[PDB]
């Protein structure tokens with residue numbers, strides 16, 4: 815970003831009008847001008863179950879391969895959207911639930927309330943971090 819002085823560019827792959835892959839690059843050499851891969855997002859849609867899965871991969875510079883970094887599951891329930899963010903646990907071979915977000919709108923798509931949670935790894939229960947009504951609904 816602007817504050818850290820690091821520039822990135824992306825390349826999107828579309829399929830049937832939807833984004834299925836987004837690859838992130840950075841320019842790390844001028845003797846070549848080659849854009850180096852940094853991150854890759856893969857999107858898995860399921861219209862019937864109203865669920866989108868975004869899988870994130872990070873470029874492993876030692877192995878020169880992609881490695882599983884995280885997973886975001888977006889579930890739609892009309893006025894309610896639930897987002898679960900999980901981190902890949904390398905030495906477990908599974909995804910650990912980390913953050914959860916809930917967005918509630920009215921029937922006109924105006925946000926009513928937003929909630930954020932962080933997973934307590936000791937108790938396996940979500941900790942509330944944020945809960946706020948928007949000014950129009952604050953009444």
Ligand SMILES: [Cl-]
Pocket residue numbers: 822823824838
């Ligand atoms: Cl980007």
Ligand SMILES: [Cl-]
Pocket residue numbers: 826827828829
């Ligand atoms: Cl494309």
Ligand SMILES: [Cl-]
Pocket residue numbers: 890
């Ligand atoms: Cl939607």
